[PDB]
Write a protein that binds this ligand. Structure first.
Ligand code: ADP
Ligand code: MG
Ligand code: MG
Lengths: 18, 340
């Protein structure tokens, strides 16, 4: 599922700029 | 009513430009405040909950080590951010109450926003319903109408930068990438998930990047995850420029249509960048139930009120180890920060 893919991305925490 | 908006923004510009041309400086000092607790990590030092000794009012104090700012080549960004904060005035922008500096540090004392940032609430709750997302989105629409009218481009919209106050309303924070831009600008900056294609593609760009970012924010609020994500930024960028986006099946038709027009790779077609400007967004069917004036007056009942048991409550923030704030007996980087 798309949600599972999001968890798999490793980018579920706060995101830094740049 | 339309004439009322024009009059409001004309007066707002007059007020902004006066403060922009003659910024306030040195409006308090460190020993006017008791340190209570570290609220978070700032770019160049701690963000502290502090208590004004004379009034007992609580504030969030950003502490910036001048030597670190110089080392990371952020002098202009830091001066510009403070110059913006002391000149703007809008309900959904954080409010700079005092600023000053000493031998070691720069200090910005803001109104304390006790709900913390939207990001944590969104990840906890999972996703926001469309009414809930629309309540927040309407505040961003008005805030960008305001900022863009002053020729300010914001460039860092994301849930991480949206603080939730005691009434459940938004206060936008972190103006580290904000710039006065009448035409085009070129700096690669922002957060990968929220970058407009024309930033990724190393083009000159304009305020339409903020309207793209609004589309990303609305999508993330309503889905619980952003429209473009991947293991590494480069793969995110490939998706952003591709012209392709998929929507959860629970998105309303009106929501999908708004998002197709905000997440529009073709600048000549993107809402917020057309002849009618922000009104293409404000007049869209998804916002048909939105009372824009009631939102601005904070008269709409908020869908979510953060927990808050009186002044000084920090229950919506993480805990950090507390360290002494040391101020050198010698001035550092005085020339660089004369204007602060
Ligand atoms: N006015 C405020 N009220 C409460 N917390 C704040 C306030 N300003 C900043 N913070 C805390 O500090 C964090 C970082 O603030 P931010 O505005 O992103 O500044 P910077 O990243 O430039 O140091 C926020 O996510 C929040 O936790
Ligand atoms: Mg910063
Ligand atoms: Mg920040």
């Amino acid at each position: 599922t798309t949600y599972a893919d999001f968890i798999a991305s490793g980018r579920t925490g706060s995101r830094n700029a740049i | 009513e339309q004439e009322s908006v024009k009059e409001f923004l004309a007066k707002a510009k007059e007020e902004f430009l006066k403060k922009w041309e003659s910024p306030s400086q040195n409006t308090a000092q460190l020993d006017h405040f008791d340190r209570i607790k570290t609220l978070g990590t700032g770019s160049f030092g701690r963000v502290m909950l502090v208590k004004h000794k004379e009034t007992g009012n609580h504030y969030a104090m950003k502490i910036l080590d001048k030597q670190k700012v110089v080392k990371l080549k952020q002098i202009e960004h830091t001066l510009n951010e403070k110059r913006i904060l002391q000149a703007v005035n809008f309900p959904f922008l954080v409010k700079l109450e005092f600023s000053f500096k000493d031998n070691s540090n720069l200090y910005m004392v803001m109104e304390y926003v006790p709900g913390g940032e939207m990001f944590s609430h969104l990840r906890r709750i999972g996703r926001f319903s469309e009414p809930h997302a629309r309540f927040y989105a309407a505040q961003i629409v008005l805030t960008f109408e305001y900022l863009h009218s002053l020729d300010l481009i914001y460039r860092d919209l994301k849930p991480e930068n949206l603080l939730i106050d005691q009434q459940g309303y938004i206060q936008v924070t972190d103006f580290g990438f904000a710039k006065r831009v009448k035409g085009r600008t070129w700096t690669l900056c922002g957060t990968p998930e929220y970058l407009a294609p024309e930033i990724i593609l190393s083009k000159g760009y304009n305020k339409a990047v903020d309207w793209w970012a609004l589309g990303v924010l609305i999508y993330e609020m309503a889905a619980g995850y952003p429209p473009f994500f991947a293991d590494q930024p480069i793969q995110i960028y490939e998706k952003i420029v591709s012209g392709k986006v998929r929507f959860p099946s629970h998105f309303s038709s009106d929501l999908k249509d708004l998002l197709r027009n905000l997440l529009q790779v073709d600048l000549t077609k993107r809402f917020g960048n057309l002849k009618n400007g922000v009104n293409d967004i404000k007049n869209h069917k998804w916002f048909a139930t939105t009372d824009w004036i009631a939102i601005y007056q904070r008269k709409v009942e908020a869908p979510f009120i953060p927990k808050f048991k009186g002044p000084g409550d920090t229950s919506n923030f993480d805990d950090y180890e507390e360290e002494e704030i040391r101020v050198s007996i010698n001035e550092k980087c005085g020339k660089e920060f004369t204007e602060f």
